[PDB]
Structures are given as structure tokens and as C-alpha cells.
């Protein structure tokens, strides 16, 4: 009559906040760039032919892109495709035999690199092998007659050469979920981050993300919606990393005009070491032709989003990174299997007033890397046969800011930070993991039998 019960439903639209594990998906197609599993696409399973996005009206779930447990899940993947394409190749501790290096065969005009030579073994055990290679003066360092050299890692790390088969080109991956868990997307335009987002949408597989080894800037990435995204966990804390995501790509023409010869050195049996073959003729260093028109275009767009952050009539400075390793001070990015650092001093320097050619950037090359600071496992990047032109969408930016100084009269800004969790976050800023609680209850007038 009027004595209420409880009634059980199954499949109610209900969810909570909980963190868990996803899985990779690169369609039934990305497998065909081959190059013996570029990066990570091998045993990973193809994607479903249609990622269903369902928009939600009248749904205000509180979001988080910073403590977001997926920004850290992403940072862990790049280490294991490394390890499971590292531990089964060529370990190179014999490469810590003293070297003899010299400014190369030129009319001087010094030389950045060295025409080196040193001692190794061959197919046979008793008999051994000397062979010459060419190293950047960054890759090597002196020791104490001429100046004698040795490799930079030998005072820190043993080394394992990678395999030239596995290409280090960042390969896109979708992030997908199973039953009981799913992914939210705050597709909204004017989205300020912290907390409730009025137009949530839900998906099974996120939009494809590229693991581009890119500090400061971001390349081959995700464009913004409407305005330019300007994020920072705490803008009043210059130790917090500040990250940019443009909606417009700046063009870059990175290349390395050198025909490289791969010397196949027997140091095994089996193990094949690659030495710098005689570089062909005229000598030019790696660079990137940046369209200055596209550069200053996105410059004026974001700068004007910033006077709204400080009074009404102000003075805004721009400078280069105040200091940091090559990943921090320069623009670091892989280019064909090798690694470039393009001296961002030729980008950050300006001041304008109240009323065809191309800039280009000088890039260095680094092969020996102890990246991921996994002291115990460093590596050598195999050499690349073929000039590496590389265009990509300049997508992001990582920077900080100065301190107190003289107030109001001005305040300055400069790039830095470096830490790749921001660059990874620029691809996951709009996502949040939840768990479904499909059981629902209510008191109706319904009774069963006894």
C-alpha cells in the first residue's frame, strides 16, 4: 500500500573516479610501415574500425590533466620498447678502448669533429682489429704527446648498441579500455581545466598519439580547438612546467645533407659494430629551415593572450633558456634515427612597438645517449644511410619565467623546464579514466513473492 521497498536495476548510467591500465591499438594498417617493428607496433592488436564518441549534455564531471594517472602511464612505455629492442642486440663495452682523434681532413677553418682511430677484436680470438671512425667532439672527451681521447659514457655507463632494424620513428598508438572502465573527453572549447566540464564526451579509444622525443617544442602532435591552450599547474610557481598547444602548425624543414657510409665491424663473432664511414666530400652540419612567416604568426597569437594576464599597460620580455642540458636549452628531437639539437637562441629574441627568406637553425648531433638516466643501460644510436629531410607540425612549447626583480616596470620570460611529462600531457590534456558501477537501486512500490 504505502510501505516502500527497494528495487534493483542493472545497467544504470553510473561511474566513479578510479585509475587502471589501458592497451595499445594502431589499427589494422600501421603494421605495414614494417621496418621490423618501428618503435613498438609488432604483437600489438589492431584497432576497431570506428571509435564511438558519445557527447553528454548536462554532465559536469570534475577533470584533472595533471595528477591524471595516464600522463605517467605514457612515460613508462618508451622505456620498455627500448629494453625489449635493446637487451637482445649488440653490447659494446669493448668500445671503451682509448682513441686517437684529430681535427679532420680540411683546409682547417676550425672543426667540431675528429678523425679518430682505436683498437678492437675481430672474428678470431687471438687476432684483433684497429678501425677508424668520426665522432663529434661532444661524443668524446680528452684524457691524460698529442691529445688523447675516450668515449664520454665510459666514466658512467656500460653501453649496448641498438639494432638498425627497429626504427626509432615515433609511431601513433590509440589508448583503449575494457568493460567496467572507460575514458572521458572534455571536447569543450573554452576549457580552463580544473574541475567540472559542462560538455563531456566519452570514447573507447583515444585519438592517436605520437611519442615524439621532443622537449621545449612539440612536433607531429595534436592541434588545439579554437583558442591556443595555455596550461600550467601553478602559474605563480616558476618551478611548475608551463606547456603550449597551438591550433596552427609552424613549418620546419630539418635535414642533414651528408651521405653516410656504414662500416660493418666484426667484433663478435656475429656482433656487428657500425663506424662512421668516410663522410662524402663537402661538409655541412644538420639544420632546420623554419618558415619565419609561420614562426612569427603563432608568436603574435599567443603573446596577445598574455597581456590579459597582467594589468593593462605593460612591458613583456623574451629571451632564450636560462640554462639546462641539451634537452632543455635546445630543441631536442629525433631525425631519422639520429638526434638533433637546434640551438633555440635563433628563435627567442624580440621586442615590438605600439603602432621571401627563411630563418634556419643550427643543429648538433648526439649518438651516445644515457637517456632515461637508467645508469646500467645506455646505448648507441645506429647510423642512418640516407639524408633525412623531416617536416612536422610544430605543435607545442615548454617554458618558464624569471623571478621578482623590479616590479611592474617589466618582467621577463624564457623557455626551459624540459621534463617530458608535459610534452606527453599535451596529447592527453582532455582525458580522464573512470569506472562503471552498473548497479542501481530505488524504492518503488514493487514486491515479489515470499
Amino acid at each position: 500500500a504505502e510501505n516502500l521497498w527497494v528495487t534493483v536495476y542493472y545497467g544504470v548510467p553510473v561511474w566513479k573516479d578510479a585509475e587502471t591500465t589501458l592497451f595499445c591499438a594502431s589499427d589494422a594498417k600501421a603494421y605495414e610501415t614494417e621496418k621490423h617493428n618501428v618503435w613498438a607496433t609488432h604483437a600489438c592488436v589492431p584497432t576497431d574500425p570506428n571509435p564511438q564518441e558519445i557527447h553528454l549534455e548536462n554532465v559536469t564531471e570534475e577533470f584533472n590533466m595533471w595528477k591524471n594517472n595516464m600522463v605517467e602511464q605514457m612515460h613508462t612505455d618508451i622505456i620498455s620498447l627500448w629494453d625489449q629492442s635493446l637487451k637482445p642486440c649488440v653490447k659494446l663495452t669493448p668500445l671503451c678502448v682509448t682513441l686517437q682523434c684529430t681535427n679532420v681532413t680540411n683546409n682547417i677553418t676550425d672543426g667540431e669533429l675528429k678523425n679518430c682511430s682505436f683498437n678492437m677484436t675481430t672474428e678470431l680470438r687471438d687476432k684483433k682489429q684497429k678501425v677508424y671512425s668520426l665522432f663529434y667532439r661532444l661524443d668524446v672527451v680528452q684524457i691524460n704527446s698529442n691529445k688523447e681521447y675516450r668515449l664520454i659514457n665510459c666514466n658512467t655507463s656500460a653501453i649496448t648498441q641498438a639494432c638498425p632494424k627497429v626504427s626509432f620513428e615515433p609511431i601513433p598508438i590509440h589508448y583503449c579500455a575494457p568493460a567496467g572502465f572507460a575514458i572521458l573527453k572534455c571536447k569543450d572549447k573554452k576549457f580552463n581545466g580544473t574541475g567540472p566540464c559542462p560538455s563531456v564526451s566519452t570514447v573507447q579509444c583515444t585519438h592517436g598519439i605520437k611519442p615524439v622525443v621532443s622537449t621545449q617544442l612539440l612536433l607531429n602532435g595534436s592541434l588545439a580547438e579554437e583558442e591556443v591552450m595555455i596550461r600550467s599547474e601553478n602559474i605563480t610557481n616558476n618551478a611548475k612546467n608551463i606547456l603550449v598547444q597551438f591550433n596552427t602548425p609552424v613549418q620546419i624543414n630539418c635535414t642533414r645533407p651528408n651521405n653516410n657510409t656504414r662500416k660493418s665491424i666484426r667484433i663478435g663473432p656475429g656482433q656487428a659494430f657500425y663506424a662512421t664511414g668516410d663522410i662524402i666530400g663537402d661538409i655541412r652540419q644538420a639544420h632546420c629551415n623554419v618558415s619565419k612567416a609561420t614562426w612569427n604568426e603563432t608568436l603574435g597569437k599567443v603573446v596577445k593572450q598574455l597581456r590579459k594576464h597582467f594589468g593593462n599597460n605593460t612591458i613583456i620580455r623574451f629571451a632564450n633558456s636560462s640554462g639546462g642540458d641539451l634537452e632543455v636549452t635546445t630543441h631536442s628531437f629525433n631525425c631519422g634515427g639520429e638526434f638533433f639539437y637546434c640551438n633555440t637562441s635563433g628563435l627567442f629574441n624580440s621586442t615590438w612597438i605600439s603602432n621571401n627568406d627563411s630563418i634556419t637553425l643550427p643543429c648538433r648531433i648526439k649518438q651516445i645517449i644515457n637517456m632515461w638516466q637508467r645508469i646500467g643501460q645506455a646505448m648507441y644510436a645506429p647510423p642512418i644511410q640516407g639524408v633525412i629531410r623531416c617536416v612536422s607540425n610544430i605543435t607545442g612549447l615548454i617554458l618558464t619565467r624569471d623571478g621578482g626583480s623590479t616590479n611592474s616596470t617589466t618582467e621577463t620570460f624564457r623557455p626551459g623546464g624540459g621534463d617530458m611529462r608535459d610534452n606527453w600531457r599535451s596529447e592527453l590534456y582532455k582525458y580522464k579514466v573512470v569506472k562503471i558501477e552498473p548497479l542501481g537501486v530505488a524504492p518503488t512500490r514493487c514486491k515479489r513473492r515470499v
Partner: antibody
């Protein structure tokens, strides 16, 4: 226990710059922000710069940027700094000191200097 | 400078002291990040208090600080010669606020 250990004493002339260091041990170097601050005897402490040892991010004030360059090493396990362009008004006891709340992912703040070096003296006359 | 410290302070052997740290609602009021220090004239310091009122394990229980809106404070009761030292403060401020040096003298 963990420590922050600095070098000895060095006396200089005007128009110079000084090597002053502060090594560390007892923990995993890579995750500890570090500052160089200078104290006048019985006065106060003035800030010149800080370092993120994860790839070397540094920052200074504006009476220092250009003068101060500042770095570290992550397997030799040591912090450096050299304020360049010395005058007779730049004498101080320089202290390395580590923050309270660092990590390897998120960040904050600027607080809490528990572990202190003994202080390295630099004189200019 | 970058932090409002007092010109000179004073206290007597056998009594007690306390110090005011005042600012705006943008620096102390909204950020639980205020730390305090004690250092003999020229000696190695050690953190007295952090996060408004927390000491490291090894610091005396005679120390304890506060945060009242835009006016924070540290209080010491029962002065011994353990406290014949110079005193400093610290506050949250964009990059970092740095004090100008409060000298401990005798008032009168």
C-alpha cells in the same frame, strides 16, 4: 643520514669569478632541487639561482642573469656554480641548500631548507 | 629586496620572544607554505618549522609557528642561550621571497 658538503676557502682579487661547489650523497641525486644563497655575517641571505638536476634547468634574478652560470653532474654527483664579474661588494658566505618537497613528476613549492652545507667563503678586495 | 623583515629585535635571557610575519592575501593567506629558521651568527642552519607549523624530527619542541591570515608568527617560550641566534623567515612568492636580515640586539 645524508649530507651536503662544500669545498674550502678561496680568496680573490677584483675582476674575478670563483669556483664554489657542494657535492651530495646518501640519496638518488637526480630528484633534489638545489639553491645557491649567500649570507652576509649576521645579516640576511640573498638569492642568486636554483637548479633542477633533471637535465639542468636553472634560473636567476635580474641583477645576476649573465653573471651567474650554474650546473651539476649526475653520476659524479656534485653541484657547481660560478658568479662571474666580481667586485669588492660581492663578498659573502655562500650556502647550498635543498628544498623540502621535490619529486620526479609534479612539483611545488619553494619551502623548507633542512639540510645545509657548512658555508664556503669568497672574498674580493 | 623581497621580504619584509624587521630592523632589529631584542629579548632577555630567562624570558621569551615571538616575531610577526605580515603580508598580503596573495602570499600567505592562500598558500600553506611558510617556513622558519634559526642560525647562530655564522653557523650551519637547520629547518625549524615548515608548512606553517611542522618541525623536522630532531628539532626542539620549544619551537612552534602559526599563520593568522596575512600575519604569521613563530613563538619561543623559556629562552635559553640555545636561542642567542639570528632569526629569519620565509614565504611563498612566485619564484622566491628572500629576507633582508634581522639583527638581534638589546632594546632600551
Amino acid at each position: 643520514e645524508v649530507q651536503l658538503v662544500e669545498s674550502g676557502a678561496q680568496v680573490k682579487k677584483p675582476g674575478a669569478s670563483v669556483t664554489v661547489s657542494c657535492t651530495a650523497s646518501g640519496y638518488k641525486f637526480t630528484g633534489y632541487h638545489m639553491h645557491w644563497v649567500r649570507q652576509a655575517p649576521g645579516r640576511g641571505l640573498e638569492w642568486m639561482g636554483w637548479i633542477n638536476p633533471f637535465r639542468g634547468a636553472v634560473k636567476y634574478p635580474q641583477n645576476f642573469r649573465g653573471r651567474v652560470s650554474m650546473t651539476r653532474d649526475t653520476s659524479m654527483e656534485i653541484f657547481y656554480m660560478e658568479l662571474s664579474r666580481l667586485t669588492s661588494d660581492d663578498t659573502a658566505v655562500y650556502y647550498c641548500a635543498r628544498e623540502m618537497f621535490d619529486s620526479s613528476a609534479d612539483w611545488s613549492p619553494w619551502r623548507g631548507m633542512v639540510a645545509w652545507g657548512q658555508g664556503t667563503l669568497v672574498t674580493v678586495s | 629586496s623581497a621580504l619584509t623583515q624587521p630592523a632589529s629585535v631584542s629579548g632577555s635571557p630567562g624570558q621569551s620572544i615571538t616575531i610577526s610575519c605580515a603580508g598580503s592575501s596573495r602570499d600567505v593567506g592562500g598558500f600553506d607554505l611558510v617556513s622558519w629558521y634559526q642560525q647562530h651568527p655564522g653557523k650551519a642552519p637547520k629547518l625549524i618549522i615548515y608548512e606553517v607549523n611542522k618541525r623536522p624530527s630532531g628539532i626542539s619542541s620549544r619551537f612552534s609557528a602559526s599563520k593568522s591570515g596575512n600575519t604569521a608568527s613563530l613563538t619561543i617560550s623559556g629562552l635559553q642561550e640555545e636561542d642567542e641566534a639570528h632569526y629569519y623567515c620565509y614565504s611563498y612568492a612566485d619564484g622566491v621571497a628572500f629576507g633582508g636580515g634581522t639583527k638581534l640586539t638589546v632594546l632600551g
